[PDB]
């Protein structure tokens, strides 16, 4: 994450040469995506299908469309509702958006099927029973 933050700052400063408002289409999306595809979060990947998955997220999230009003971070999490991109221009607006996220996270937030947590949740529930019983 820190390396990705430095890369974002390095290339944004390179393009926006001391300016107040850089055009979204002038943001170096190719530089940011490739460096994260190959070096940052990419250097750990030793699997082509995991590499393709990493490329898929980077291609979806880092474009000029991310600055559109109706950008969609995730689609159809619960079948009907989905997560919208906040229309913020300042940091505090984004932090407010994060704090207003519901406590109803499902693996569909991650692009996974909602049944991915079924076995994992079931084991923990049995694990909680075993731990409670042991302390009795």
């Amino acid at each position: 994450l820190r390396s990705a933050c430095d890369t974002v700052d390095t290339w944004l400063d390179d393009t926006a040469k001391g300016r107040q408002n850089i055009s979204p289409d002038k943001i170096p999306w190719s530089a940011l995506k490739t460096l994260m595809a190959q070096s940052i979060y990419g250097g750990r990947v030793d699997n082509e299908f995991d590499q393709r998955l990493l490329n898929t997220f980077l291609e979806r999230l880092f474009t000029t469309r991310s600055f559109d009003s109706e950008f969609k971070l995730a689609c159809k999490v619960d079948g009907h509702k989905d997560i919208q991109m906040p229309d913020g221009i300042r940091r505090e607006e984004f932090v407010q958006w994060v704090e207003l996220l519901p406590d109803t996270q499902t693996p569909s937030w991650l692009g996974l099927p909602n049944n991915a947590e079924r076995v994992l949740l079931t084991t923990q529930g049995v694990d909680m029973i075993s731990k409670m019983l042991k302390m009795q």
Binding site: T56, G111, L112, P113, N115
Partner: protein, 144 residues
Amino acid sequence: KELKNIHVCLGGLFVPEAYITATRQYVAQANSWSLEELCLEVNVTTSQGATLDACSFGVTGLKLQGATCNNNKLSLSNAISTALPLTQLRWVKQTNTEKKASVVTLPVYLNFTRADLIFTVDFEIATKEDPRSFYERGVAVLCT
């Protein structure tokens, strides 16, 4: 010669990857081609015991994870594993015409741990299913 006509459970084989290479080497030998010149076409049958072409091989026990196969057209599924009755692995001369904008390459792992890749299959998706959704949901094929 009867080794070609017998259906094979890839999970049972000790080295399933070598069987994939052997079938690729078998077809290129008859047609005097190179192994790089053969691409793997996959056909899934409703029932086992179907007509086996000269350049085709029957494989049993493949399990589709996160999708269903219907008429060689994958659709996303909310089930965990879908059994593939009989998968025909057919080797054909490569024509390097790229993808088809509705084709997903699915990894075929040996078991549920997905620690060992055996080979890759190409399927055609159906409806408006985004191929990227197949990538994000971890759609794959298991040998056992």
